[PDB]
Scaffold this active site. Structure first.
Site, PDB file in Angstrom:
ATOM      1  N   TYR A 122     -12.005 -21.553  35.818  1.00 31.39           N
ATOM      2  CA  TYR A 122     -11.867 -19.864  36.045  1.00 31.39           C
ATOM      3  C   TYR A 122     -12.681 -19.228  36.723  1.00 31.39           C
ATOM      4  CZ  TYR A 122      -8.077 -19.620  32.366  1.00 31.39           C
ATOM      5  OH  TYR A 122      -6.727 -20.000  31.772  1.00 31.39           O
ATOM      6  N   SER A 174       0.091 -22.774  30.459  1.00 30.54           N
ATOM      7  CA  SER A 174      -0.766 -23.580  29.778  1.00 30.54           C
ATOM      8  C   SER A 174      -1.509 -22.894  28.788  1.00 30.54           C
ATOM      9  CB  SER A 174      -1.752 -24.321  30.797  1.00 30.54           C
ATOM     10  OG  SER A 174      -1.069 -25.179  31.702  1.00 30.54           O
ATOM     11  N   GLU A 175      -2.058 -21.741  28.729  1.00 29.43           N
ATOM     12  CA  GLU A 175      -2.761 -21.136  27.656  1.00 29.43           C
ATOM     13  C   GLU A 175      -1.927 -20.452  26.624  1.00 29.43           C
ATOM     14  OE1 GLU A 175      -5.840 -21.708  27.647  1.00 29.43           O
ATOM     15  OE2 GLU A 175      -6.828 -21.271  29.587  1.00 29.43           O
ATOM     16  N   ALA A 176      -0.807 -19.987  27.237  1.00 31.50           N
ATOM     17  CA  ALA A 176       0.404 -19.800  25.895  1.00 31.50           C
ATOM     18  C   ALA A 176       0.702 -20.789  25.309  1.00 31.50           C
ATOM     19  CB  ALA A 176       1.405 -19.010  26.800  1.00 31.50           C
TER      20      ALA A 176
END
Length: 261
Positions: A122, A174-176
């Protein structure tokens, strides 16, 4: 390897929910869980990867390649100039890069390398996007749709354009999948752009520590407090699995037994 398709161009809340369900059900280990929360498999279980095909409103597509063991995005493909173009992150080993090439673009006689010339952290993606925090890069369905059109079938594009698309796609896919909380932020804002709040960011940054805290908890009690953020940027000191479980879609792989329900 499976390919799950999400139609961003004709998306609805219910089709996004189904997409999330399908991706979690593909990625999860068939049996590992802790406190009822499904866990990702070890690095050896096959298929080792999951593909996610994102379709825009002109039926152009971009396919993400996810590692099943941790859901990190390894790279993506698109169709240009009659070829499958594979774009791999520079932080993938040679052996995994071979899998990415051959999984995204199995026809070795009609493919093209177009590397992603930076790593997947990130901090790196934010630097390429020009932002001090990815709170400054809005998420949303129309943004994802638009971003696909700036890249898919496009010969050349800037690292800022690419990094923006990756920030959006990594978080809405991916984060969801990792976090029902983040799925739910997308659904609550389905009709609009939104900025990821402090709780989104905290969950994303702490996913591995959360998995360990839950795996290690005895009778639902965390062994030590787990400090996260609430959506108003205040501290959230988690003490029991009960408080964090609703936000979880998948646990990171953790070796060893745990309390399974």
């Amino acid at each position: 390897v499976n390919t799950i398709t999400f139609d961003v161009g004709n998306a609805t809340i219910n089709k996004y929910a189904t997409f999330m369900e399908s991706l979690r059900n593909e990625a999860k280990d068939p049996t590992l869980k802790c406190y009822g929360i499904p866990m990702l498999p070890d690095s050896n279980l096959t298929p080792k990867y999951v593909l996610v095909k994102l379709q825009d409103a002109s039926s152009k597509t971009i396919t993400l390649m996810l590692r099943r063991n941790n859901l990190y995005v390894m790279g993506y493909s698109d169709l240009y100039n009659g070829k499958c173009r594979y774009h791999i992150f520079n932080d993938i080993s040679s052996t995994e890069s071979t899998d990415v090439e051959n999984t995204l673009c199995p026809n070795s006689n009609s493919r093209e390398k177009k590397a992603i010339n930076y790593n997947s952290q990130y901090s790196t993606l934010q630097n390429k996007a020009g932002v001090s925090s990815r709170s400054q890069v809005q998420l949303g369905i129309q943004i994802l749709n638009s971003d696909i059109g700036k890249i898919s079938g496009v010969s050349t594009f800037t690292d800022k354009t690419e990094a923006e698309f990756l920030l959006v796609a990594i978080q809405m896919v991916s984060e969801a999948a990792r976090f029902k909380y983040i799925e739910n932020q997308v659904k609550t804002n389905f009709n609009r752009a939104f900025n990821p709040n402090p709780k989104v960011l905290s969950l994303e940054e702490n996913w591995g520590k959360i998995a360990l805290a839950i795996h290690n908890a005895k009778n639902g009690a965390l062994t030590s407090p787990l400090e996260l953020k609430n959506a108003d940027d205040t501290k959230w000191i988690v003490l029991r699995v009960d408080e964090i479980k609703p936000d979880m879609g998948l646990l990171n792989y953790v070796s060893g037994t745990c309390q399974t329900t």
